[PDB]
Amino acid sequence: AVAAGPCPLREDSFTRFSSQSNVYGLAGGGELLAATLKGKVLGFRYQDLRQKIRPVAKELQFNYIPVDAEIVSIDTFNKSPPKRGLVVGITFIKDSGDKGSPFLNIYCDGSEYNLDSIAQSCLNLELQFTPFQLCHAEVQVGDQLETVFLLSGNDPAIHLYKENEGLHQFEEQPVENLFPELTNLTSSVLWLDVHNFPGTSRRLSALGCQSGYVRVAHVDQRSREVLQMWSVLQDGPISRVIVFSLSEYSVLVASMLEPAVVYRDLLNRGLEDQLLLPGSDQFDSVLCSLVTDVDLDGRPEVLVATYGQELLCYKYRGPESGLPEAQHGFHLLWQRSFSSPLLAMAHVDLTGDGLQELAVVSLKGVHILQHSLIQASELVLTRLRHQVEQRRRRL
Amino acid sequence: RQKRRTTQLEEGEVGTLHPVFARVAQRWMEFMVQIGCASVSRSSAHMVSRFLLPSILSEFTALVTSMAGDTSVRIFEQHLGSEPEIFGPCSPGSPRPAAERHLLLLGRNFLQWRRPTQQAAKAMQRFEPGGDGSSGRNAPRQRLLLLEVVDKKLQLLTYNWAPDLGAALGRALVRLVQWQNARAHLIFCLLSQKLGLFHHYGQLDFNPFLLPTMEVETLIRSASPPFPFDEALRDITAADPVTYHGQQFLEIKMAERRELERQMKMENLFVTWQQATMPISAGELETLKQSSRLVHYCATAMLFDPEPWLKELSLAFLQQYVQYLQSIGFVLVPLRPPTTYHLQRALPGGIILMELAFQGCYFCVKQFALELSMLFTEECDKVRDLMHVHSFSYDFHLRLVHQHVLGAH
Amino acid sequence: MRSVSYVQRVALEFSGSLFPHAICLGDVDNDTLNELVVGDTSGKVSVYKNDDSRPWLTCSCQGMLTCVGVGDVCNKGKNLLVAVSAEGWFHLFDLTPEQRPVFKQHIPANTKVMLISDIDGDGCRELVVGYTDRVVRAFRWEEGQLVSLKKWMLEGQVDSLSVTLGPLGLPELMVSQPGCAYAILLCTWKRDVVLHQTNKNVSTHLIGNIKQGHGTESSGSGLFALCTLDGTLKLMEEMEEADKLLWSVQVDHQLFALEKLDVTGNGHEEVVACAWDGQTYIIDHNRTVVRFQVDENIRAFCAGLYACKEGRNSPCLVYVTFNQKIYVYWEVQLERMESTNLVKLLETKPEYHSLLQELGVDPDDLPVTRALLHQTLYHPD
């Protein structure tokens, strides 16, 4: 419950938000898109100038959204590698007098990658249920990879909206056709991850629902056959689930009333090997999470954003330095602090150098954190010098 | 000698549970309802989420002590998690998320258990008490409660208890469980709010207490039964999960009941004086001052001085200055509806307040202000140049000396 | 241009009203650690130490306070806590090992501002007091009692007093003048006021003696800054013939304070300006702007070193809020002041160029360099 080392992150800029967002507000792009509840959407980027850079946060407008409409979720992706362009999906709710009127807008336009052109290409589609999360996945149909939308609904069902070149439009299709594991749901699904495998026809699918039911499925794609299945009933809503390779595969479950945990060796031990992240429950409710290498050591670490304005970062030890009883578990690497509840993160190279900035969307706005440049300037030089020396010794 | 071990064991204080209560008194003890006997009991608890177990257990212990002054409630949860007969006492007290516990409450009367021969607790007892007092024909009769717990499943089992007592216990347990479920529903609504999904969940669409007349504060503030809530935590960035989240929400909400009063008062006593009315309360003066910044001040010394007559002269000087100020546009503000003077002059950009008082051998003038704002400040420092707190003292002293010339004392 | 958002802070309880010049920070117990001093209208001076919200101690004065100061005005080499009321009363306090004063000495009333410095360069320190009636009076403590010195009279209002190393290497006293002007007092005792004008009666604040190098504080000055209430900031150097304007910035807020503070730790001092609505600005000597918005309304502002945690002085910001709370931000240090990523910070180093020359590379493409950086950063094997 004690940090080991200081935070190597230095905050660069901070753009204030007039109105708050929600956990589904953060989108991708090397630009960035973030939308507020009241329909104001902003594009974040950086512009170079002589020997420095400057953040730019430019508001954007989409054609067919009512001024009274309230935006619920947003996402986007790039077209399939055979194709070209980007597609942006936004789900809002009209206020039909005293009822909700859900909807879904899909924007996709040379100008296939031009965001300004894509700003007005939408299609208006009813939803008949209150949407929860707009995500997307890539599937192997025939011998071609195709990217399709996914959207959890008020009725415990996931509704796929596939593109069609014949009509050049997105139409709803049954989810059982492509995703056998995404059927027969009891509670609404807050978060859902589809982890493809590299180069094979297999993959994993992880999902958690409001009641705390978490289902993980090892699913093929060529035969569309579920191989195995595991499920666990926890307490409290499942805020986040991420499928990641620790070094073999493992998963991370971030609840809202219990310490976040990681289940190891899914394909070899099911869901019986559990490691809890110590002390990650003393800071209110874990609203977000992200798994990547923040230590620049070539091995991933776990980021946990709490409602109590905390940004804990946990590091895995590793059997390579296995220490008997205190075995290769998890320990608190370091801990930062903020002033607003934390909602979403992103790990994107906005500057344009190869170093990855961390964008954090909180209640009042967006913080662009960078690595400590002084630390990230001597370390690269030492690595390069060692590389040259070993090359000479090996020459 | 041997005093603690005969109570640490044989009384359920330490050690482990007997194999009798491990599995025997749950079979053919429950079947007493199948055959039909005088120990029927049941429960239908279906708790949503397991984090309510400790509060529910504490309340149930309280109830047991309430309608039983002889029971000896003692939780015997198996604190090993291996499999067999792991029941180790948990002194007046979770580990893993997915782990589902297994608890076994018990209730007993040690005094009656000491030597059952007479009426244990007549009229609040077995309803089969007593028994022949003759030796060998002694009285086998006692009472017990053996509530069992699964992940989310309670089963109430009583034996040899007053039927009204048992029925009341069952009804109370069901009601308490429903109370806790309603509290959990409120907490879930709050959590769904926190992520920024407002019209996705809510304490409007969904049990005696689930009616659309729920008293939120009573549920939050109580662990036992006796602005639009759907958008409470929206754009608000203010500083047992149920207690935690509920009290946080309570303070967040009270931070508006204790705030909008100030705005209401300031708007009221700005529009009233904009176009003095009434004796504004003394307490309101503190708000009016602490909500305003001390812009300018001026001071002078009363030279007609080295006394009661001096006090009277100072009062006359003060009243002359008050008259002069009133000849400019500033009105007087009455005070003390249970020597210091206060004036004012409302302006379109805001209000201006002046305080006049005498300190030792000096006279004090302070100007407050309370608000684009450039125009207000342009006229805000248009009273400073017209204070003239020096020429006035000059003329006052000269008039006083002339009057004393035209007179005597 | 870039904004920031500081986080760490400590709140202190302080109920009352005070003038904008009734707050200061400095060492009073001679422990080499600064403490916070606030003098209220009610006639009490509270000193906060370390991080407790409750005041460390309190001293009682007579009359209502308008100026506070800490320093070795007595020229005894020990720091004293002096207070100046509105009724022309001077009070002195010493607490280095309640708290009644030790020296009361009446003076002219209408006291507005205050300064302590060795203006004459005589080795003694001469207390200087401005008055709301455009009158400046110099004093000196001689054994003990206070004695008067040359007095100056001006037309425009007096807002601040500053001591700056003049072109001849001698300390110079200047005072702000409405209309974005400033006057210099010659103090020839060992015209007497010379004014320079750079709307009509806009209030102007001014600060001087801003450092330019590491350790060059014993004898270093030459820079001074003006701020106008209608949102106009200027930094300029005096030097011999005619003062040279370094930079000028136009903003759209009501500026009501002006301070100097070193945050990057490189030796230079940065201009720290505030506003009524709380939009703080920080600018270095090269027109690099760092904003900081506090979602409140500000009564009083302060800056400088403070000792909050671990018994180590650190740069701080002090705000007084309408909600009877004093906020102290004590983690304001910045790694730099501009925005540079890695492809231009590392470009400066020449060893990097030589070492990239050894590895058969010569940066021209940029994607190649990015790939090399990514491999060296996230792929150490």
UniProtKB/Swiss-Prot annotation, chain A:
Keywords: Acetylation, Actin-binding, Cell projection, Disease variant, Intellectual disability, Lysosome, Membrane. It is found in: Lysosome membrane; Cell projection, Lamellipodium; Cell projection, Stereocilium. One of its GO terms (cellular component) is lamellipodium. GO terms for molecular function: actin filament binding. The keyword Lyase does not apply. One of its GO terms (biological process) is protein localization to lysosome. Coiled coil: none annotated. The keyword S-adenosyl-L-methionine does not apply. Its main location: membrane. InterPro entries: Integrin_alpha_N (IPR028994), Kptn (IPR029982). PANTHER family: KICSTOR COMPLEX PROTEIN KAPTIN (PTHR15435:SF2). As part of the KICSTOR complex functions in the amino acid-sensing branch of the TORC1 signaling pathway. Recruits, in an amino acid-independent manner, the GATOR1 complex to the lysosomal membranes and allows its interaction with GATOR2 and the RAG GTPases. Functions upstream of the RAG GTPases and is required to negatively regulate mTORC1 signaling in absence of amino acids. In absence of the KICSTOR complex mTORC1 is constitutively localized to the lysosome and activated. The KICSTOR complex is also probably involved in the regulation of mTORC1 by glucose. Part of the KICSTOR complex composed of KPTN, ITFG2, KICS2 and SZT2. SZT2 probably serves as a link between the other three proteins in the KICSTOR complex and mediates the direct interaction with the GATOR1 complex. May associate with F-actin filaments. This is KICSTOR complex protein kaptin. It comes from Homo sapiens. The lineage of its organism: Eukaryota, Metazoa, Chordata, Craniata, Vertebrata.
UniProtKB/Swiss-Prot annotation, chain B:
Coiled coil: none annotated. Transmembrane segments: none annotated. Expressed in the brain, predominantly in the parietal and frontal cortex, as well as in dorsal root ganglia. Expressed in peripheral white blood cells. It is found in: Lysosome membrane; Peroxisome. It comes from the Eukaryota. As part of the KICSTOR complex functions in the amino acid-sensing branch of the TORC1 signaling pathway. Recruits, in an amino acid-independent manner, the GATOR1 complex to the lysosomal membranes and allows its interaction with GATOR2 and the RAG GTPases. Functions upstream of the RAG GTPases and is required to negatively regulate mTORC1 signaling in absence of amino acids. In absence of the KICSTOR complex mTORC1 is constitutively localized to the lysosome and activated. The KICSTOR complex is also probably involved in the regulation of mTORC1 by glucose. Part of the KICSTOR complex composed of KPTN, ITFG2, KICS2 and SZT2. SZT2 probably serves as a link between the other three proteins in the KICSTOR complex and mediates the direct interaction with the GATOR1 complex. It is linked to Developmental and epileptic encephalopathy 18: A severe autosomal recessive neurologic disorder characterized by lack of psychomotor development apparent from birth, dysmorphic facial features, early onset of refractory seizures, and thick corpus callosum and persistent cavum septum pellucidum on brain imaging. This is KICSTOR complex protein SZT2. It comes from Homo sapiens (Human). The gene is SZT2.
Swiss-Prot record, chain C:
It is found in: Lysosome membrane. Keywords: Lysosome, Membrane, Phosphoprotein, Repeat. One of its GO terms (cellular component) is lysosomal membrane. InterPro entries: Integrin_alpha_N, KICSTOR_ITFG2, WD40_repeat_dom_sf. FG-GAP repeats lie at residues 19-48, 110-139. The keyword Membrane applies. One of its GO terms (biological process) is cellular response to glucose starvation. The keyword Phosphoprotein applies. It holds the Pfam family Itfg2. Part of the KICSTOR complex composed of KPTN, ITFG2, KICS2 and SZT2. SZT2 probably serves as a link between the other three proteins in the KICSTOR complex and may mediate the direct interaction with the GATOR complex via GATOR1. The KICSTOR complex interacts directly with the GATOR1 complex and most probably indirectly with the GATOR2 complex in an amino acid-independent manner. This is KICSTOR complex protein ITFG2. It comes from Homo sapiens (Human). The gene is ITFG2.
